[PDB]
């Protein structure tokens, strides 16, 4: 048949403003056809790792649920967004499971997200009592109690605000420039699968 | 639960906020320096005041974490720089007076003019002025006039100011549990808490003397040869036995003897290395200069420059109205932003300066993975020595013939090496007695061994004893002659230049033994050898995370500063000078024989 009603990957990838990594957006994708080969053929993506598939298996295998998680990080912790890594974003902001079956897509966004006075709107969580579970989200702004003394909500010598701002100025070096990262999760449940690759007529 | 986890969280918070505010301050300073505008001055003042207030607040919070419960040495190294009270230990009145004193030192030193007494019609500043007449003119009387005029004016301006400065700095150091402010300057070389590698700050004044007592015969032969050669331009003014008059040394303070090379060249008929006419005939550019420097760096195995460096550096005079400070400065703004501010001409000296500043940039990029407190040289001499390695390597005929700049059939015989080593001596071993004397005088002044009424007598006595220079006319305590230099008037430590000049030859000998160069050290090029680059990068990458003794031992195998590579570098020049001074009076006694 003809191919129409594709998945809105252009809604996710080409968005005007992405979310920060402490409050990453998660979008459920279902009941549509997705062209991953179009994403691979685009040379603009500086980082494209897939951890349980190849783009050929992306085209040839149908899936039930596709979750697109989007956030902005720096270039240095792009390698942190991976299964089994240990690091500040991976511990306190966005944890991937060890048996992850999906793709991690990252590209530089210095020409959109950076501004000359500093884009302080992109936050990240610096301190947390415990590490996150895989795909956990925590938008709480609880004051981190690093010592035995109670915080009672106020700032102190051992009570710190857990969120810190990225600078994101255009004169930053590579590794400090903002990188928009989209993470796709593929999994199979006990449900009728509906998302699958395009068909050559 | 414990102290160390709280200290580590506090250090992480300080690292992130300090990187942000330090990037703001460094960007404001860059925008001031490449673009002289009063709005940029106000912006740079506001950024510096914000960073200073932030550093004072985090220094206040750092005292709550005691050091003696911390077992991790990196946490101790990051926290000791925060726990220093600095000038904040004084009262507000005394701190404000000290800051005002430092500012008026800066404004008095910056605003000196060279107008003739009874002829005030026209004159310039120091930089278009005193440098030209002191460097290029061969006349005795006008050099004496410029020397006496500048030193008398800045002495009468700066004499009581320096006395209040030394009193206030001694009070600030004694309040900060140091013995004196000279002892506070020696705190940069202090290493504690590492057994075997401990280096007391009182051992530095032993090691400097122990190295200088083996410098001294070479400097005596160099001084004897210079004094013998200077008779040709000044026949009656100087004596064959006594010391040199001060205003004949080709520099306003005698710090660098580089300008005396044209008067004291051994073989003027030999074609010396110039590579400037050949550079301009090949039609080079500043971009070509820095690209050839970057090609030299990747031959050793160092990583190349970022694209932001090429798009953000100012390598050429920007235009008509956009005035800038033309001094060569390498800039590490942090967060991967590295850039060079140095105006260029088609010159061999600008090529070597580009190598120097790119070496400083590579040293800054090397410790980028370190936390913010450890993003510094292991001591104050390392960061200046790493550029001098590149300056020594790029000046060799082997590197110039490799890049196609020098003629391929240029013959490197004996005379063309001796006259180059003499220029390197006038650059390097000439600054050693002046540097050691000046820092010894400052250490004795800050210690309190010299009263007010004996400053100039002891200074000129140690100049005659160590440097072998007599004053042209007698001077008294109404002047303050050493304070005429930039570094002493602007509260800079000056012992960095001695340690730079020994660490550069220790590093050069280590890398040339790593690069398997079988020839002499002065002809050695450390280019094209990855095995030298890895040894270099292993100490470049440490930053302040390791003691400077351990980082030194990583490359040269010795955990103390050593002087033998400097001696064996100048070994053919030393043998030629020993065979030259067969009949001249080698060395000197302290004397007033040329001028009483
Ligand atoms: C995003 O924008 C580019 C350029 O306009 C376009 O070619 C592309 O199809 C858009 N969508 C995706 C998913 O890349
Ligand atoms: C340099 O300063 C002048 C002073 O107003 C300003 O107009 C100019 O834009 C500045 N240059 C740059 C590159 O910003
Ligand atoms: C000091 O702390 C850092 C950061 O936690 C750690 O990597 C390092 O191993 C510690 N050093 C020692 C000697 O425990
Ligand atoms: C630096 O060197 C690498 C490897 O040689 C190269 O891929 C890169 O393009 C170079 N970058 C610049 C700015 O020369
Ligand atoms: C360094 O290696 C390059 C690559 O072969 C060569 O062109 C150059 O002449 C070498 N330099 C020296 C000094 O041998």
Author numbering:
A (entry chain B): 330 to 530
B (entry chain E): 19 to 614
What does the literature reporting this entry say, word for word?
The most prominent mutations are in the spike protein, which mediates entry of the virus into cells by engaging with the angiotensin converting enzyme 2 (ACE2) receptor. Despite being phylogenetically distinct, a common feature of both the UK and South African variants is the mutation of residue 501 in the RBD from Asn to Tyr (N501Y). X-ray crystallography and cryo-electron microscopy (cryo-EM) structural studies have identified N501 as a key residue in the spike protein at the interface between RBD and ACE2 that is involved in critical contacts with several ACE2 residues. Mutations that emerge in the receptor binding domain (RBD) of the spike protein are especially of interest given their high potential to alter the kinetics and strength of the interaction of the virus with target cells.
Local refinement of the RBD–ACE2 interface improves the local resolution at the binding interface to approximately 3.3 Å, resulting in unambiguous delineation of the Y501 side chain and other residues in the vicinity. The overall structure at the binding site is almost identical to that of the unmutated version, with the exception of local rearrangements that result in the aromatic ring of Y501 being accommodated in a cavity that is sandwiched between Y41 and K353 of the ACE2 receptor. Y501 in the spike protein and Y41 in the ACE2 receptor form a perpendicular y-shaped π–π stacking interaction. We present a 2.9-Å resolution cryo-electron microscopy (cryo-EM) structure of the complex between the ACE2 receptor and N501Y spike protein ectodomains that shows Y501 inserted into a cavity at the binding interface near Y41 of ACE2. This additional interaction provides a structural explanation for the increased ACE2 affinity of the N501Y mutant, and likely contributes to its increased infectivity. However, there are marked differences near residue 501, which is completely within the ACE2 footprint, at the very edge of the ab1 footprint, and well outside the ab8 footprint. To investigate whether the N501Y mutation increases the binding strength of the SARS-CoV-2 spike to ACE2, we measured the binding parameters between ACE2 and either unmutated or N501Y spike protein ectodomain trimers via biolayer interferometry (BLI). This revealed that the N501Y mutation confers a modest increase in affinity for ACE2, mainly driven by a reduction in the dissociation rate constant (koff). Taken together with recent reports, these 3 results are consistent with the hypothesis that the greater infectivity of the N501Y mutant stems from improved binding to ACE2.
